Every structure is written in C-alpha cells, then in structure tokens.
Amino acid sequence: TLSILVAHDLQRVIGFENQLPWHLPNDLKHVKKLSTGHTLVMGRKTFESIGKPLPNRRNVVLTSDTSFNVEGVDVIHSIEDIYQLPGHVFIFGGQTLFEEMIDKVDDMYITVIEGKFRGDTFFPPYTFEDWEVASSVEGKLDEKNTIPHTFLHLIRK
Numbered sequence: 001t002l003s004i005l006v007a008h009d010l011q012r013v014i015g016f017e018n019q020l021p022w023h024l025p026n027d028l029k030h031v032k033k034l035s036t037g038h039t040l041v042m043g044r045k046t047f048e049s050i051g052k053p054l055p056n057r058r059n060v061v062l063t064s065d066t067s068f069n070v071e072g073v074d075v076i077h078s079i080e081d082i083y084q085l086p087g088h089v090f091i092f093g094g095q096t097l098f099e100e101m102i103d104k105v106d107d108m109y110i111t112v113i114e115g116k117f118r119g120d121t122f123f124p125p126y127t128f129e130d131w132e133v134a135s136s137v138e139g140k141l142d143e144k145n146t147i148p149h150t151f152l153h154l155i156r157k
C-alpha cells in the first residue's frame with residue numbers, strides 16, 4: 001500500500017523556510033500512530049530539516065547524491081525504487097516529492113489545518129472528483145492544540 005502523509009493549511013501551505021509553520025501535537029500523535037512499524041519515504045531536503053531518523057519505523061531518503069550515508073537511514077536514488085519496498089509505505093514529503101507522487105499513490109492521509117499561515121512550500125492541488133472521503137474526523141482542541149484541524153483519509157476513485 002502506497003499512501004501520502006501530509007499536513008497542509010487552507011491554502012495548501014506545507015512549510016516555511018525549511019520547516020513546519022505550526023506546532024500541533026495531535027498531528028504528531030496522528031503521524032506516530034499511523035507510521036510506526038512501517039516505512040517513511042522522504043525527500044533529501046526534508047530529512048535535513050528533521051536531522052535524525054524517526055524511531056520505530058523504516059526511514060528511506062530519496063536523493064541523487066550516491067554518497068549519501070546516515071546512521072539508520074536507507075537510501076534510494078530513483079522514483080522507481082519506491083515500488084520495490086515491502087509493507088505500508090508512506091510518502092512523507094516534502095513539496096517536490098508530493099508533486100511527483102500524488103498521481104501514483106493509492107491512498108492519502110491529510111491533516112487539514114483550518115487556518116492560513118505564511119509559507120514557501122505547498123501541497124499540489126487536488127479535486128474531490130478523483131478522491132473519495134473514506135473518513136473525515138475533527139481534531140480535539142486543548143491548551144496544547146489550539147489550531148482547528150481535520151483528519152482526512154482519501155482513497156483514489
């Protein structure tokens with residue numbers, strides 16, 4: 001199963017200056033609950049923003065740099081390599097990888113941030129004619145999670 005894992009705002013902003021424009025623990029909980037014990041495929045630039053690999057999951061980084069070597073990280077150099085990965089594979093970002101993979105994924109796990117932030121990286125546009133809403137769940141708001149958000153699970157028609 002090949003799925004996109006993304007969090008974008010009302011205008012599909014995903015990042016600003018190599019990082020997330022918001023901190024939302026509920027979305028992090030959503031990521032860990034969903035990707036733990038599976039595989040994350042991310043672009044090279046996104047990994048450098050994180051620094052370390054994420055624990056309890058297989059971390060794959062896509063890069064043209066063949067000399068790439070980081071502790072506890074598997075390396076791939078082509079978009080084709082993704083299909084030769086066992087189990088549930090999550091496309092983790094960022095922009096350029098989302099742009100390439102949107103047309104190829106079966107599945108899509110989107111956290112819609114119900115706001116408008118300043119950003120320089122975006123998620124590709126998508127119509128609901130191509131995607132059916134498998135589930136739409138509102139996020140609960142506490143003192144630590146003050147930005148309204150909706151968890152969407154989208155499956156390709």
Ligand SMILES: NC(=O)C1=CN([C@@H]2O[C@H](COP(=O)(O)OP(=O)(O)OC[C@H]3O[C@@H](n4cnc5c(N)ncnc54)[C@H](OP(=O)(O)O)[C@@H]3O)[C@@H](O)[C@H]2O)C=CC1
Nearest residue numbers: 006007015018019043044045046063064093094095096097
């Ligand atoms: N809100 C969210 O869900 C997320 C947001 N983001 C945000 O997005 C931004 C990152 O976007 P972006 O700058 O596009 O970063 P990316 O991680 O998507 O960059 C991808 C990089 O990997 C390499 N690469 C990508 N595709 C290929 C390919 N097909 N073949 C060979 N190499 C490839 C390229 O560099 P090279 O080959 O030279 O190494 C490229 O620069 C950040 O600002 C971040 O904050 C990121 C993830 C999630």
Ligand SMILES: CCc1nc(N)nc(N)c1C#CCc1cc(-c2ccccc2)ccc1OC
Nearest residue numbers: 005006007018019020027031049050092093111
């Ligand atoms: C965590 C939001 C996020 N949510 C969703 N629904 N999909 C995603 N693909 C990402 C993402 C990302 C990429 C990303 C993640 C973390 C992070 C922070 C704390 C703990 C674990 C990871 C830090 C920087 C970063 O790049 C800027």
